[PDB]
Every structure is written in C-alpha cells, then in structure tokens.
Design a protein around this ligand. Structure first.
Ligand SMILES: OC[C@H]1O[C@H](O)[C@H](O)[C@@H](O)[C@@H]1O
Ligand SMILES: OC[C@H]1O[C@H](O)[C@H](O)[C@@H](O)[C@@H]1O
Ligand SMILES: OC[C@H]1O[C@H](O)[C@H](O)[C@@H](O)[C@@H]1O
Ligand SMILES: OC[C@H]1O[C@H](O)[C@H](O)[C@@H](O)[C@@H]1O
Ligand SMILES: [Mg+2]
Ligand SMILES: [Mg+2]
Ligand SMILES: [Mg+2]
Ligand SMILES: [Mg+2]
Ligand SMILES: [Mg+2]
Ligand SMILES: [Mg+2]
Ligand SMILES: [Mg+2]
Ligand SMILES: [Mg+2]
Ligand SMILES: [Mg+2]
Ligand SMILES: [Mg+2]
Ligand SMILES: [Mg+2]
Ligand SMILES: [Mg+2]
Lengths: 386, 386, 386, 386
C-alpha cells in the first residue's frame, strides 16, 4: 500500500526534518536533531538518501579536528544504513556576513570568502559521493533599487560560477552544478528569480554543460507560474539535473509544505511529466514539517511526502494507460502537436496554397478542441473515480 | 516643460489609442479610429512613430486591391507627418481559428496558416522600414494540463521561429525578431511566461543572433517580478531589442495603464537603467486609455505617457549627478561590486589566506551597507525634495 | 455513478453555458444559445434550475411587447422541463452607460437609471419565483485614486440598497438580496472587494436582515484568500444566502473554470463545510466553458461541474465518518476548540491560578498538534486511497 | 525642510527600530537595543511616542520585582524625554505555547492562559496612559483544512474579545481595542484576514463600540487590495482607531519597509485621505530596518518614515488646493457623487420618467469621465512638476 523503497530514490535534506520551527515571529518548537539520528529514521521510512549544507553537518567555526569527527560519525551512519548522499550544497545565507549576498555581495572580500567556503564543501561532497552540487543564492538580491547594479551583479555571479567550473575540471571531479531559483524571500527580489532566468544565465557561462537547474515546486508558484510547464522547458533544454519537491498555497511566503499539499493538480501533472520523461535523478523533498508538530508529526509528514508521490504516480500511469484517455488525446490532436509543422521546408510551405490562399479559416475555427472532456478524464483518474 | 519631440523616440501602437474599450464584461465605449487620424494626432503630440499588427492596418479578409489601398493611405499619412514605423507584429490571437494558438496550435494546418500570415506581414513591415518584428504568442498555452505537451509545443515554437529566421536571411532582410513574454491572459498559462524563459528559449534557436526580447512592464509585474531587474538581465545578454512601456497595479489582469501609473518607483528605476545603459531603441507605449474616457481623455492619456517618461528621466539624471549620491554609492560599495572578485585567478584565490583562514568574519559582518540612506536620497530626488 | 438529479439543487446561469467566448483579445468562438435551448439541455443533464440577468433573457432595448414574448417563451420551457428559477440579477455592467458604475456612478442620472433598471427586474424575478436577488457591482470602483471618493461612494451604495429594501418591503415581496464581492476586474479595484467587506457593509444598511452574501470561489482566490474560511465566516454570521461555484488557478484574471478545477483541495474543504453545515440553498455554477470548446464541450464542462461536486461530497462524507479520522480529530483537540474558553466567567478566570500563576507553559508547548497526520488522512480520503 | 515635531504624532513600536534582523534564513545582524535607548533616540528624531508588546518591555518569565524595575526604568525615560505611550499590545505569537494560536488555540488551557497574559498587560497599558490596545492574532489560523473548525474558532475569538470588553468596563478603564488584520504569515491562512473581515466580526461582539481596526499598509497589500479604499471603509464605519504605516512591494512575505517605500502612489492617496478626513490618532510606523543596516541605518530608516509622510502631506495639500484640480474634480463629477441619488424618495423615483422611460442612455454613455487628466494632475503634484 504505497510503501517506498530505496529504489524509488526519495531523498531529504538534513535541514528539512531537522527544522526546529523558528520562523520570523516565533522561537523554535522542537529540539535539534543529530544528523545521525535523522539518517537512521529516514532509512527506516524507506528513503534512499540525504542531502546537506556544509553548516548542517559541520557547525560553523569548527576546527579541522572537530570537522573530521563530524564527518566520520556521519559516514558511519551512512554505512550502517545504506543511505546515499546524492547532492550537497553550501550555506551562503545564515551567517550575518552574507547579509548582502555571497557571490554578489557588494564587498569584494565577502565574495572571495563565499567562493572559498563553497570550494571547501565541494571537496567534501565529492568525498561523500554526491553527483550534484546545488547553489541557492538566497541572499543575492536587494530590497531597494540603488543598492545593486544588476548587470555588475550578474558579472560577479558569472565570475563565481566560472571559477567553480574551473575548479572542478582542474581537479577532475565528476560533479555537476544545479542553480536553484527563487523569486523573493529573504531578499525583496532575488537574482535569477525563476527557472527561465536561471536557464538563460547558464548559457552565458564558460562551460554551460556543467550547469543545470534545481527547480522547487513552491518557488515557481511564488511567482504564480505553472511548475510543470517550467519543468518541461528545463527538460527540453536538457538541464533538469535535480528537483526540489514540496507544496505551496499560492503567492505568499515560502511555505515548504509536504509534497502533495498545496496545489494537488499541479502535483499530479508534475509526476505525470517526470515519469513520462524518464527523469532518473533523485526525488528530493525540500519541505518543513509545520512548527505545530512534535517529532511524531515530523516523521508522519516526511512519510506523507513519499506516499503522495507514489499515489500520484499510480494515478498518472492509469491515466496514460486508459484506452479512453488515449482516444481523447487523439480527439484533442495531441498526436498532431508532435508532428512537424513544415518538414517539407520553407519553399514548399510558401508554395502550399492549402496553407493560406485556399485555407478554410471558418471550418478550422469551428473544430472544438475537446479539452474539457480530456481534463475531466484526468480528474476522474486523480480522484479514483475510474 | 517636459515637451516631447520626435528625437525622444516615443512610439505608440495603433491598437493603443485605437482601443475601443471592449473588455470581457462590456461593450465598446468609443468609436473606431481611422489609422490615418491616429498618425496625425500622435504626430501633433510629439510622437516619433507608430507600430501595427497586420489586422490593425488591413481588415481581416481584405482583397489584394483593398489591401493596397489601405497601405497607400497609411504611407501618405506617414509622409505628411514625418512619422516612422520602427516595429510591426502579427495578430495571431483575435480570430477564432487561433483559439488554441498559432505557432503551437494542436492542429497542424493552423500552425502552417499562422506561419504564412506572419511571413506576409514581414514583407510589408520591411517595405515600411520597420527594424524590429515582435511576436507575442498570446494564445500559445493552455487552461488544463493534458491539453498541451509542452516539450512538443516548444519543438513547434522553435520550428516556427527557425523558419522565420530562414525566411528573412534568404530574402536578405535587415530585420530582427523580438519575443514578447506574458505569463497568463488570455490563456490560463502562456508559454515563455517571463523575460527569463524567452531568453533561455532564444539560445536554442538555429540563429540566436536574430532574436531578442520585447519585455512589457505590466507583464513581468503580473508575475510579481522586478521589471528593472529583468531588463538588466536582458541588457546583460545583449538582447533588449525593443520595450513596451506601461503601468500595472500588481498581480491581476493586464491593466495596460499609462506609463508612470502603477508602480511609480519601478518606473523611476527603469528609466534610470535605460538611460544609464544607453538603450537607443524606441520608447514604445503599449497602453489602453481606460474605457471611462472619451477621445479627449485618450489623447490626454497618451500625452501623459511621454510626460511621465521625461519627468522621470530628469529626476534620474539629477540623482546620478548629485555629488552626495555619488558619495553614498561609494559608501554602499557599489564601486566594489563592479570590480572583479578574483582577477588574480583561481590558484591565487586558493592560496589567499586573507580570503578564508585569516578572514575576519565578524568584522565584515558588522559593516552596515548604508542602503537605507541611499534609498532615501533616491526618494528625495524622485519627489523633487532635493 | 455520480449522476445528478434535481434534488441536488444544481443551478446554472444562462450566461455560463451561453458564453460565446469573446475575451479581451478575441472574437466569439461559439454562436449564441437561445435561452429555451439552454433550459432544455440543462434539464437533461440533471440540473435543478437556471438563473439570469435581465439582459440575458430580454435583449436590451426591447419593447414591452417583445419583452412579454420573451418571458412567455421562457416560462413555457420552464413548465415543459420542471426547471426552477431560484435567483435573478441585473446587468449593470455591459452597457457603456455603466462605464463608471451603476449604483456609484459619479453621474447622478446614471445612478437613478441603475435603480429603475434593477427594480423592473425585481418584479420579474418575483413573478418567476426567485427567492434570492444577487447584486454584483462589477463596475463600482476605479482605476485611479482621485476618480472616486470612497466614503461618498459607500454612501451612494448604502442609499441604493436601502431603497431596494424599501421597495421589496412596501410591495410585500418574499425575496432577499445577496451581494457578490469581487476584488478587481473589470475595474482596477472594485468596492466591497471580499466577503468580509460585504459582510461589514451589510451591517450598516437600514434593514440588515434582508441582505446576505453570494461569495464566488474564484473571486476570493483572486485575492489569495482561503475560500472555505470566508464561507465559514459568512455561515457564522448567518449570511450565506447563495453561492457561486467554479475554479480558479491563483491570483490572475477571473478564469471561471468548471467547479473542481483550480484548487482541488479547497474544493474538497468547501464541500465538506457546506454539507456539514447543512447549507440548503442552490449549488450555483458561475463558470465559463473555455473558448477552445465547441457545444459538445460546453455540455461536457457543465456536466463536470456537477460530477465533481458529487465525487467530493462522497469523499468528504467518508472522511468525516471514518473512525480513524474521528480519533485523529480528538488527537488534534478539535473537540476542545468547540468547548467554551471560560464558561465559568471572568472573575473565576481571574481567580484561576492554573490559568496563569501555576500554568506549566513548557509542558503545554511540547504537545504536538498532530495536524500532519490528520491532513494526510484527509488526502488519502480525497484520492480514494482509503 | 520636512522636520517632524511631536505635534505630528509620529509613533514607533519598540520592536521596529529594535528588530535585530533575524529572519527565517539568517541570524541576527544587530545587537539588542535597550528600550530606554530607543526612547531617547526616537525623541531626538522628533517622534511623539512609542508602543510596546508586553514582552518587548518585560522579558518573558520575569519576576514581579524585575518587572517593577523594568517599568520604572521605562517610565523615567518617558519623563526625561516627554514621549507618550498611546498604544500597547500583547505578544501572543513568539512563545512556542502559542504555536496553534492564543485566543483560538485548540487547547483550552492555552486559550485561558492567553486571556490572563493579555489582561495583565491591559492593566499596565492603562497605567502608562495608552488609549488604544491592539490585538494582532498572528497565530490564529491554520496550515491545513481539518486542523481548525473556523466557526468554532470564531466563537472562541468572540468569547475572548467579549471577556476583554467585560474586563475593561468593570474596571472603568478608558481604553479601546483595535484588531489588526493580516491575511497570512506566520500561519498559512490567518483568521480575520483583511480590514473587511475584522469590521464584520466586530459587529457581532457584545459591545461593538469598544472595538475598531488597526489596519497595516503592507498587510492589505499582501492580499492585493487597495489600502486607501480599505481605510475609507473603516472611516465610513467610524472604526479607524489606529493605523500601522509601512511599505510593501506587492504580494509576497510581509516586508515592513519604511513608509513611502513600496507602493508610493498608494502612500500618496493614503495621506490625502487621512488628512482630508481629519484622522487625529497616532501615525504609527510598524516597520523593520532591513538587516543589511547597522545602527546608523536604523535611525536613517526611522527618520525616512517621518520625512516621507511630511513630503506626501505637502504634495496632497497642494493637489487639493490647486484651482485647476478643483476644476478637474468638477469635470469628473466628484461633486455629483456626493449628492444623494434620490433624496426625493422611492415613490418620486418610480414616477420620474427622466430616470428610465425618457432617459437618453446613449447621450449619458458618450460623456467622458475625464479621469486620466485628473490623475495626471495628481501625478504632476506628487512629483513636484506643478
Ligand atoms: O540550496 C539548498 C537549500 O537551501 C536553503 O535551505 C533553501 O531554503 C532551499 O530552498 C534550498 O534548496
Ligand atoms: O505583440 C504586439 C501586441 O499584441 C497585443 O496587442 C498584446 O496585447 C500586446 O501585449 C503586444 O505587445
Ligand atoms: O451577478 C451575477 C453575475 O454577473 C456577472 O456575470 C459576473 O461576472 C458574475 O460573477 C456574477 O455572478
Ligand atoms: O500587534 C502589534 C504587532 O505585533 C507584531 O509585531 C506584528 O508583526 C505587527 O504587525 C503588529 O502590529
Ligand atoms: Mg525553498
Ligand atoms: Mg522553499
Ligand atoms: Mg529548495
Ligand atoms: Mg500587454
Ligand atoms: Mg499588457
Ligand atoms: Mg505589449
Ligand atoms: Mg465571477
Ligand atoms: Mg468570476
Ligand atoms: Mg459570480
Ligand atoms: Mg505587520
Ligand atoms: Mg507587517
Ligand atoms: Mg502591524
């Protein structure tokens, strides 16, 4: 009954089930979790692996000896459980030194520090077997217009990512970078605010093949955008390296609800797309168990992430396999959308009188698209009414 | 007193001052304008030129003889006034045949018709001297998830733009394309919904140098995004070919208010950016005089577009020239943002102990950014309190 | 299998299935429906009744003889089908005379005309058996700040509704008024923009008992508000006289999707609330079949409205009847929420040392609310996974 | 030059300039301010007074002896500076015990504790001379639909406010309550989310005359609503007891920018309304100096709040005094909006053939409203171009 196994590739950040519940108006409601306990409890729930920021695993300001001790404890728990570490990232947002950003801070010495802190954790990530290194520039942005020249900031952002790309290639590391966009919060506006802006920025880097995107459900929905559409564009570009799954109720602060909460139909179409396209990376949950919950509610919330993915996977597969749905897809001409508009070429199109001079515009206009019947079949499948 | 002249390059679409006021809940409140009158009245207001959709100038379904007559009347008014036509575009959204899109309609014969209708108007645009050809795919999208496979739709969109690029290069035309993004309306979600998505898509075309963006103030604000930030990214990529200026009050239907209305401070920072960067293209207003207005209010609204641009231009220039502002920009380290993070290179950065091992993180963290003082100087300049 | 019958009280506006598909960017895609055909087709689908604006039934500017003919044809179709007319309303938004509003137009003669047009249709509504008369002030508002003094406009709005209340009581009519809020569109901002503002306004009328609200799913969601919460407040006040059911995908133009589309989980909690509270009025669909559809898609879309209500009704009933859910509701202390905080009174509360001086604040703080487990049980029931 | 004096009645919360800069993603960037220093520094800037939560002034868990010491220190600083305390409020949101609310927590013992904590601070507020007691129910709400029965929660909310009203009247206190709405954050949805919902709720309390609203600029804008319109409705109802001034850039997390930032034109129309209506209460700033700033930037930001109010006050007064604006107001028939629609009464309106049978609907429809000219005069005045 919708039981996850490690083969489903479900992963969780240490900072997710470990969120203590401190929000901008309230103190923590839960004690801190030891990373080792989190690994053990997630393994028992059926997770495949965990992810981390450097500062989740090694407390900021630790000596090199305490650092080695923290990593050894962690690696032992991974060995004991069989859990993997597919992705790692850098905390460039919590410490007050990053209050105006890391890679695009106005202060040059902070930008250099940001790069050195990142490079140190890339080495550790590689040692733990991570294949993707995520960058979320949560402090790269501004509250006011004159504080940040955005062209200069983009030069600095490109400079930082180019240097990281030079570092991994000169070390011979087999790791790729994924940029995680977010439109706002904690800065008034954040640079590279959507999947689109991130994809466009990647094409201006020196080695674009090393960089993709790590889109998050809730972040694109904070701009009112269609998350499955944005994922489709990322797949079309060959840039979907990783994904952050959660839920969000509309345009407001980043809620990070468990996956399946928030916009349920968008979650259905997302799963349909990921499974149809054969996305093979981790199904990573970046979520926060609400601060109303005790530790029992934390693990119930984490289990619900995986359960909802598996239910939606079943419903989307039943939808696509239903002969009546396949007939409706042809009724709505989805098959024609997949055929080239003009494989005969430009000159033949120009000479084709059935394309313009003799095109019956009123007869084509009268054809219904039959989209509402198709969408109700999708609703029936989602709700288990078929 | 803030009087425009043709040298300011202010342009208007025929469909703007010509909007009859029909909205989804109401009949037209104004009679149709003859395009010739619009050209004459705009010339008297100080405009530089006009833009058009094919169907604004030539009524849909006109014979080739009526078509020639409509163009000749138009060209005579241009000659009489000295007005230019810097941009043209295609109507691929009003006729019911385009109800599921033009370039990405599920029906293949509609997609071919869409291309032939576009190519016919590219010829006319070139004949009238237009340098930019805009494409707004307002019907390319969906209300429901199963109606549109977005990867196939993007293949079709790329196919269409590649064919248009092949057409202009084989004809030897000196015209470039600009894609105008919009997140939604009239479709539930529109493909390429923001500047970012459009910029990323352009990099996958066969001849990317032929294509840029035509961002619109209100459209990016319908996604809650920072319009000056998005323009900065378009300039950074070298893709700001044209711009649509207007006003918008937040996340709601596309209001198309006169420029300066809506988000006034965003308008200030936009003008500051366009003038600082030396944008040399048309300052094009895509706006709708509210349907409360008679024809006197139409021309008052059009005049206000240009007036507000010129006032904001003066205030932004005074801001940047103020020695106290220049001092505050250095206080906030905008000069340091423009300097390379690591021109000494990767190895020197790795060997630089002042970048990490000996970096005083508490002293850097205590430095204030002085952004609020800078922003209040900007406010004082905008309001004329300095 | 989820078949509606007239006993389910499903009703539709004539303007819904009759929407021809004209939007702000496109011509109609469907021919006009005769109101008589709409009544017949809806009766065959299982609807209970229809609603109308005056101008849906009697074309604007009809003579008194044509008017009588239109009503007689309509009444014959009602007699032939058994369909009821539970609600009627006035079109105070389509004609250009209403461009600045009806009840709050700046021009006094327009406000008087608006009242006379309304009163004429109240007489007809009563003759057809309507129990609720809806007012949607879609043109009452402004695009700019100086155009409308809102205190004066509210005086005029109160004056209009007071006069309507005097009219129905002096005629001895058994009809009540329902105000339908909407935050924006077609005006930049609309007066009484949410359920809350409407409820507050009603308390200042001379006869508040005659007035309630007609909330619409999509309208509250255009302000990012929680529609079931707003309905709960309307029920708590005893003011839910009527309801408009449809779907909406977030903060954007008013989509009027079929009910169940848009925010599916909000639709579930709405149905749960309406059925639990014993709301006995019409389940009215104010929706627009998308303009992609032909007439077959129109009736498929209307049928889907009713189907989705009935599926959600079944799932909500199963949720509330599940013993495991009843146990979880007690685990989350929903039973304690329903018990008075201080039925012992103020003085006993002040003397209760267990309420403050001896209250163990750390022990109460450690109690988990168990909300995530409860919400996953609700998800399982919605998806038919239990 | 726009210098505030105590006669302008500018007030600040202790928690505003005292905000240490901890946000959901970052540690504090500023040390804590002693309340006594804040009073002294604000007095030097020209403020009139300060406001406080109980927990701002007396650290949570203080003994009665430490409590007396904290109040005495505070009162001495008030005496030394001449600063007043016009408003006080309760912190019912920071401590983990309030994680599911205070007045509407599911746990009954928490609701009783919430009432006792409030009543204790009402006594202190009265002792310090406060005239208004604000309640912001920031934790009253839910992230999921089944967690909170909203009708029961509203019963509990009414019960709490009724008990507070009984307490102040039995003590003979001359203090009134103001409810501060907010739509979301930190809860997914907050009860009484807008001015409208709060106004409607007040009419169901046992002693409605004791309760009004404390609207906040940014909170109504988090729902995309027109803040001056909402203030106008609060004034129309006689319920504007207090106001929170700040700035907000659209629909996103609560930014609490300094007043004048965010939506500048809305700030202009707000000041125009408050001054025209003769609002005589405190001009209270609930803002957060961005965490980029050091203490010099904190006081620059606080000074900017007051400066921007005074500049906008001057521009709005010049607008209303300009003879050309007065002429334009009559051109747009603002004078007619203020005249009764039907002072002649219902029967005379029914008998008035010029109101319907002989009303020239086409001639009235052709009249322009001249709103765009009026709005450009308002723009010219705001920018100092007239
Ligand atoms: O970059 C890794 C993570 O860092 C922070 O926790 C962000 O809140 C999250 O969105 C991001 O995915
Ligand atoms: O593409 C040219 C224009 O076409 C339509 O009028 C759109 O509404 C406008 O946004 C666009 O700029
Ligand atoms: O008032 C009845 C109806 O009138 C209009 O059709 C509105 O768009 C709809 O929202 C409203 O319910
Ligand atoms: O109630 C007083 C204040 O409490 C909290 O600080 C809120 O964030 C603020 O909005 C409110 O005004
Ligand atoms: Mg996130
Ligand atoms: Mg997030
Ligand atoms: Mg994330
Ligand atoms: Mg537009
Ligand atoms: Mg627009
Ligand atoms: Mg445009
Ligand atoms: Mg509606
Ligand atoms: Mg609607
Ligand atoms: Mg409606
Ligand atoms: Mg606030
Ligand atoms: Mg706030
Ligand atoms: Mg406040």
């Amino acid at each position: 009954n919708y039981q996850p196994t490690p083969e489903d590739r479900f992963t969780f950040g240490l900072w997710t089930v470990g969120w203590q519940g401190r929000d901008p108006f309230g103190d923590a409601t839960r004690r801190a979790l030891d990373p080792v306990e989190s690994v053990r409890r997630l393994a028992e729930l059926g997770a495949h692996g965990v992810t981390f920021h450097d500062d989740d695993l090694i407390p900021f300001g630790s000596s090199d000896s305490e650092r080695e001790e923290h990593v050894k404890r962690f690696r032992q728990a991974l060995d004991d459980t069989g859990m993997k570490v597919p992705m790692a990232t850098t905390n460039l947002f919590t410490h007050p030194v990053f209050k105006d950003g890391g890679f695009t801070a106005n202060d040059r010495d902070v930008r250099r520090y940001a790069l050195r802190k990142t490079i140190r954790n890339i080495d550790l990530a590689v040692e733990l077997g991570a294949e993707t290194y995520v960058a979320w520039g949560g402090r790269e942005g501004a509250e006011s217009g004159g504080a940040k020249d955005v062209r200069d900031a983009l030069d600095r952002m490109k400079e930082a990512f180019d240097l990281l790309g030079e570092y991994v290639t000169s070390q011979g590391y087999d790791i790729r970078f994924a940029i995680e966009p977010k439109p706002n919060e904690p800065r008034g506006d954040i640079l590279l605010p959507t999947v689109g802006h991130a994809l466009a920025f990647i094409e201006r880097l020196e080695r674009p093949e090393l960089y993709g995107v790590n889109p998050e459900v809730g972040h694109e929905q904070m701009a009112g955008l269609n998350f499955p559409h944005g994922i489709a564009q990322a797949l079309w570009a060959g840039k979907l390296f990783h994904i952050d799954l959660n839920g969000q109720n509309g345009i407001k602060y980043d809620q990070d609800l468990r996956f399946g909460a928030g916009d349920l139909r968008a979650a259905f179409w997302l799963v349909d797309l990921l499974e149809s396209a054969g996305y093979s990376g981790p199904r990573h949950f970046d979520f926060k168990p609400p601060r109303t919950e005790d530790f029992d509610g934390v693990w119930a919330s984490a289990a619900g992430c995986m359960r909802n993915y598996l239910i939606l996977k079943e419903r989307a597969a039943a939808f696509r396999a239903d002969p009546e749905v396949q007939e409706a897809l042809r009724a709505s001409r989805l098959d024609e959308l997949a055929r080239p508009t003009a494989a005969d070429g430009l000159q033949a199109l120009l000479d084709d009188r059935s394309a313009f001079e003799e095109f019956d515009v009123d007869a084509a206009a009268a054809r219904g698209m039959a989209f509402e019947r198709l969408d109700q079949l999708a609703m029936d499948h989602l709700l288990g009414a078929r």
